[PDB]
Amino acid sequence: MVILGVGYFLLGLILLYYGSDWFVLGSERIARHFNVSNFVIGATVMAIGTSLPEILTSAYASYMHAPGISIGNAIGSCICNIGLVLGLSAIISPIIVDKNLQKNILVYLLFVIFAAVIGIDGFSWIDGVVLLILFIIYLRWTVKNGSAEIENPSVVFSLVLLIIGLIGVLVGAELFVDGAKKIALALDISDKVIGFTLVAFGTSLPELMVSLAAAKRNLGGMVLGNVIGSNIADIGGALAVGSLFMHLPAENVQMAVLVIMSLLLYLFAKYSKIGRWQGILFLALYIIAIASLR
Numbered sequence: 001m002v003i004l005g006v007g008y009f010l011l012g013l014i015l016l017y018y019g020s021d022w023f024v025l026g027s028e029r030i031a032r033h034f035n036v037s038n039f040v041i042g043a044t045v046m047a048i049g050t051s052l053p054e055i056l057t058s059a060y061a062s063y064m065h066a067p068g069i070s071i072g073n074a075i076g077s078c079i080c081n082i083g084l085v086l087g088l089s090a091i092i093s094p095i096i097v098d099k100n101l102q103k104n105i106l107v108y109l110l111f112v113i114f115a116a117v118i119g120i121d122g123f124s125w126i127d128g129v130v131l132l133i134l135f136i137i138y139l140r141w142t143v144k145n146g147s148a149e150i151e152n153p154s155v156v157f158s159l160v161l162l163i164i165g166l167i168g169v170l171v172g173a174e175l176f177v178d179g180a181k182k183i184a185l186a187l188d189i190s191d192k193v194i195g196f197t198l199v200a201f202g203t204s205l206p207e208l209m210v211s212l213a214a215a216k217r218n219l220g221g222m223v224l225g226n227v228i229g230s231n232i233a234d235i236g237g238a239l240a241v242g243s244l245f246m247h248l249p250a251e252n253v254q255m256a257v258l259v260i261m262s263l264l265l266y267l268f269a270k271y272s273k274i275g276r277w278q279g280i281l282f283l284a285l286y287i288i289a290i291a292s293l294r
């Protein structure tokens with residue numbers, strides 16, 4: 001069963017590789033079709049699509065009476081797309097944030113702080129409803145300020161490329177995790193806090209691969225949109241749905257970390273830029289986090 005495990009592992013890795021580029025290319029074409037910025041298509045379509053694992057993981061975990069995992073992989077994903085994902089992408093393709101995007105990032109920061117504040121006691125179902133509504137408003141507000149649309153061929157291929165791309169990365173992530181679980185099982189290596197905090201990683205591979213793909217094609221806005229949007233999607237969506245099934249226990253330490261990194265993200269976007277040395281810091285902080293957090 002290790003033989004299939006190896007097979008699933010790199011094939012999914014191959015799907016993650018090409019599927020992310022196709023998802024990026026498809027989204028970029030769709031953005032130009034509906035006359036919206038790359039940030040917009042990244043913060044909505046791409047963000048939500050890549051956050052489907054978190055949502056279904058949080059929903060499932062909390063439903064199976066494991067709310068700590070539910071909040072733990074919602075919030076863990078946040079720290080991860082700012083620290084690891086954005087960190088790598090910033091180095092690859094430095095971003096100077098325009099003022100229209102700085103405002104969106106400022107709203108993000110307020111959202112995170114607010115979630116952190118009402119989250120001190122934990123996360124009730126009402127807490128979840130609130131976050132989900134703000135999530136909806138954000139998506140609406142982001143689209144309106146990012147769209148300038150005035151206006152069956154060139155769209156169809158664009159849409160197909162986006163859909164196949166998303167299926168590629170979602171399935172690719174599945175096979176990566178599955179293929180990994182099989183090798184660990186067949187080699188009797190299977191721990192399951194490893195087994196968790198790696199499915200708590202495979203949850204975040206779609207965001208990682210997709211952002212790296214956009215970074216290589218110098219689509220900084222799409223990257224930034226993907227990171228910001230995925231965090232609101234995991235908090236206002238994944239975390240939210242989790243609280244609907246069960247009260248999520250407080251994660252003040254990780255929330256404090258998330259707020260700080262979110263704060264740093266805004267400041268860099270407002271007065272400096274998101275380039276190499278800012279990317280350096282994010283990676284550093286992520287290293288310290290995965291070395292000090294549990």
Ligand SMILES: CCCCCCCCCCCCCCC
Binds near residue numbers: 004007008010011
């Ligand atoms: C250079 C080593 C091979 C690289 C390409 C590997 C492709 C592996 C595909 C595995 C498919 C397994 C299907 C199992 C049902």
Ligand code: NA
Binds near residue numbers: 048051052207231233
């Ligand atoms: Na996402």
Ligand code: NA
Binds near residue numbers: 051053054077205206
């Ligand atoms: Na995800």
Ligand SMILES: [Sr+2]
Binds near residue numbers: 119122123124127
């Ligand atoms: Sr609460």
